[PDB]
Amino acid sequence: EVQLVESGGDSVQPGGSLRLSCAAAGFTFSSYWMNWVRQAPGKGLEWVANIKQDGSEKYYVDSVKGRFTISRDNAKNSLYLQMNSLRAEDTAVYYCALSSGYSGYAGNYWGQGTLVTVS
């Protein structure tokens, strides 16, 4: 089947940085768009970021502008999200999602989620 497995979440110190990663399997990676979503506990889903199928373009929610970076390695079937000056306010479960829809802005297949705790 189609699966996304994210990890890299941990308990980290605010003001520092954290690199999250997602491994994809069960499908061709270089055919789709990849999306990131975060969900703070007790809250609904927010939108965080995206990346173009060929890696030529990245996209972000304004709230992470200048702080988050997305890139991927299509030879490893995986993508990365790294965030600097990580805020205590940004405590959330981060999800890796695969977007196969028409415009490619939102995911259809979702990973289990990795918890990012900042303290």
Partner 1 sequence: SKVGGNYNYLYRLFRKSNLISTEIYQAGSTPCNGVEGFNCYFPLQSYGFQPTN
Partner 2 sequence: QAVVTQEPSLTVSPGGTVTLTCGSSTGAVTSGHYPYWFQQKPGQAPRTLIYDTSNKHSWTPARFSGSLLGGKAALTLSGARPEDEAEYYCLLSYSGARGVFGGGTKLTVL
45 binds, among partner 1, partner 2, none (CB under 5 to 8 A by kind): partner 2
Per CB under 8 A, the list member of 24, 78, 92, 113 interacting with partner 2 is 113
- Cα–Cα distance between 113 and 102 in angstroms, integer? 24
Q: Which residues bind partner 1 (CB under 8 A)?
A: 1-2, 26-28, 31-32, 98-102, 108-109
32 binds, among partner 2, partner 1, none (CB under 5 to 8 A by kind): partner 1
User: For partner 2, which stretch binds (CB under 8 A), given 11-19, 44-52, 69-77, 81-89?
Assistant: 44-52
**HEC-encoded secondary structure of 26-75:** CCCCCCCEEEEEEECCCCCCEEEEEECCCCCCEEECHHHCCCEEEEEECC
